Amino acid sequence: ERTWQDEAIYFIMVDRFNNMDVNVNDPKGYFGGDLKGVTAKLDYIKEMGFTAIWLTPIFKNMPGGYHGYWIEDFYQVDPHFGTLGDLKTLVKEAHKRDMKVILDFVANHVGYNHPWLHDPTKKDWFHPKKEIFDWNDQTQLENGWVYGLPDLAQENPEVKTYLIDAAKWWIKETDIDGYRLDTVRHVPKSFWQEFAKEVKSVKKDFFLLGEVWSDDPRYIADYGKYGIDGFVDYPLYGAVKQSLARRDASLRPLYDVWEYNKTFYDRPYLLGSFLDNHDTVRFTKLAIDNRNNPISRIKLAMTYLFTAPGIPIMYYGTEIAMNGGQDPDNRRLMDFRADPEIIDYLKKIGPLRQELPSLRRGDFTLLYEKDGMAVLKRQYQDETTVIAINNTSETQHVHLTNDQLPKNKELRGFLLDDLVRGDEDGYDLVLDRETAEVYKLREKT
Ligand SMILES: [Ca+2]
């Protein structure tokens, strides 16, 4: 029985991915990417082990809304990205390939100068125009105009009804499988609770992925009490910047995050892990700034995501070491004829997560970490895997005891084909610099 903790998500900003059906030299303009472009790359995505895609919003936007987040019409596809038919086609085609489609949904606000502002029957549809002054004050966070965006009043039953109805409508119309929920910390928990109860009732197993941009796992985790299934893991991202983004950096922060997640969240396996997104600098730029090779960095970093708990979420272009700084330079036009070195690697590790249940459902034990060389063990049912990640500049040796693994078994490697024979003293792993290995325990009984 496939569940959401089994998935891996390829995350696409639509206008910036693939134009098959507008000024490319304007960093804040439309580049032309559309839904037909997404559909044409489903096999491409599936091959790297992704079982699901998340699209940025595709509703009709206010002028300039290339990214989709400035909604105008909640009941219409933006003509820049194509038609309702195109979208239905995308979902059908993904479904043929056993892939899920999550759409990006905004309940918090509409685009700048939205017409409802000047509609007398919808004056009560908005909070008084106010800046968010104290980003630790929940009332301001919830009533303020986020980056000046007209902020909707979900306490008004008309707004609450309009939004929920619209959300349900797209599920019925196109058979999507989830929503990534925008600006969740800006909308009251009592609304999300009802939204979740109602939207998710349209379709069995319909998944909500919340964006609560906080570095405090307890803050995010409380929203899990209000019907949102999973969350983008911003606390992990903080760890990623200090660990995976720099060679010879301890990987302990990453595990500490998990240890905290498992305790704070009811569903810690539905936390979306990411090396970057459309709101951060590119991981490639983090690596370059650290005077590291992006190629080996990304291969190493994505191996952690694909071997750790949660739901891996990879931003389009990561697989070609896409460079980029602050929004909008992190949204460059995708390249489908770049070097395939990371793609070929991902074609090993991505699918490997799908093929070994312990990587999707196992526990997550730290057997060893010292200065960037980490060894982890995951167990699920009869299966035991051991993941070793060498984040250092040299070959590393790690000895595991017969108290950390059953005695006298064998460990087969699934990245570099390798075998490790246990003895009376335990097991010895040796990894070259900046390499990882996934071992599955082999039984001799
Ligand atoms: Ca709000």
Coordinates of all heavy atoms in Angstrom, one line a residue, residues 108 142 144 151 186, ligand 1:
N108 N -4.1 32.7 1.1 CA -3.8 33.8 1.9 C -4.1 35.2 1.2 O -4.4 36.1 1.9 CB -2.3 33.8 2.3 CG -2.0 34.9 3.2 OD1 -2.5 34.9 4.4 ND2 -1.1 35.8 2.9
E142 N -0.7 36.8 10.5 CA -2.0 36.4 9.9 C -2.8 37.6 9.3 O -3.6 37.3 8.5 CB -2.8 35.6 10.9 CG -2.2 34.3 11.3 CD -3.0 33.6 12.3 OE1 -4.0 34.1 12.8 OE2 -2.7 32.4 12.7
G144 N -1.5 40.8 8.4 CA -0.7 41.6 7.6 C -0.7 41.2 6.1 O -1.0 40.1 5.7
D151 N -4.6 40.9 1.5 CA -4.7 39.8 2.4 C -6.1 39.4 2.7 O -6.9 40.2 3.2 CB -3.9 40.1 3.6 CG -3.7 39.0 4.5 OD1 -2.9 38.1 4.2 OD2 -4.4 38.9 5.6
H186 N 0.5 32.3 7.6 CA -0.2 33.6 7.5 C -1.7 33.4 7.5 O -2.4 34.3 7.5 CB 0.3 34.3 6.2 CG 1.8 34.6 6.2 ND1 2.3 35.5 7.1 CD2 2.8 34.2 5.5 CE1 3.6 35.6 6.9 NE2 3.9 34.8 5.9
Ligands
CA1 CA -3.2 36.4 5.9

